[PDB]
Write a protein of this length. Structure first.
Lengths: 138, 135
């Protein structure tokens, strides 16, 4: 496999094109990584969560990493790693349009992880992309 | 609204055996770093090979890691496992040769797909958890 690093613009294309990543957070040196659906816009990754461990850990330590990848041709692939900052988006009017937009894109996907009983109680947030790197195998 | 439940530890081992790709997260000074990784699960441990580089350097400094694995279910369903783990680097010694040889026999073709020394290592599973979602 030719493996090479991706340009900044190639990294953006991978993030833009995909909807699922793995999000890692940490507490006291211990990482924690889970899958997450996101929507890319404006050098942020937007997402919804129910309350829980990852939200608690990111509230206390907003340093995160996100990994996103896709297939190419044959055994080919492209992968991006984002080093980021968690920013919670409280349910206030200044974030309502962001919330409405994100929810409309993620609403369907949210039906694929959100536990049923037996975007109101949801935590809406974004990951600000501070550093980004990419790799491709041909 | 998915039907979601927690898996037993036994159910988690079955997911780990049935899959060969995970995401490995390590950390340095509070900053996580997550990359894809091919692994072979065996007894208390995930085994993998790597070239020298950032993840290996970070794990040498801080052995605390997390590994996430998932697979599809019926329809929109899925199962996911998260391992809270401790990195242990494995020199090429007789006591680890069977572990290495077995791991390579499971992963040798896959290694072609990402590409002098290999570093051979394992992650000791300290906690494991899982989730299953059904439509
Ligand atoms: C493809 C896909 C997309 C998803 N998208 C989202 C999303 O956008 N937003 C969202 O909030 N969740 C999403 N999930 C579910 C997410 O991965 C978590 O399972 C869920 O959010 C609960 O995480 P938590 O930290 O709140 O766990 P808590 O409810 O606080 O539970 C903590 C315990 O559960 C375990 N645990 C939690 N999740 C998993 C898991 N995935 N696998 C194994 N163990 C787990 C932890 O290790 C720990 O033991 C998605 C899942 C899949 C497979
Ligand atoms: C399905 C699949 C299976 C893989 N299996 C293995 C395996 O078993 N063993 C193994 O060593 N590697 C595997 N890889 C490659 C792995 O994900 C890393 O890209 C590679 O090991 C280099 O990691 P490093 O920490 O040594 O980075 P270094 O060579 O030390 O480089 C660090 C820099 O490159 C960036 N970087 C590293 N990896 C990636 C990536 N995946 N995507 C975007 N940026 C990246 C970092 O963010 C940082 O900027 C696999 C990849 C895929 C897609
Ligand atoms: Cl699968």
């Amino acid at each position: 496999m030719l493996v090479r690093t991706l340009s900044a613009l190639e990294c953006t294309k991978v993030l833009t094109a995909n909807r699922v990543g793995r999000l890692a957070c940490a507490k006291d040196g211990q990482p924690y990584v889970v899958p997450l659906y996101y929507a890319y816009s404006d050098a942020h990754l937007y997402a919804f969560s129910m309350p829980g461990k990852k939200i608690e850990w990111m509230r206390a330590n907003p340093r995160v990493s996100v990994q996103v990848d896709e297939h190419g041709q044959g055994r080919g692939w492209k992968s991006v790693v984002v080093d980021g900052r968690y920013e919670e988006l409280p349910d206030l009017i200044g974030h309502k349009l962001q919330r409405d937009h994100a929810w409309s894109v993620l609403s369907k996907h949210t039906d694929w992880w959100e536990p049923g009983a037996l975007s109101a109680p949801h935590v809406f947030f974004r990951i600000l992309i501070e550093q980004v790197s990419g790799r491709e195998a041909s």
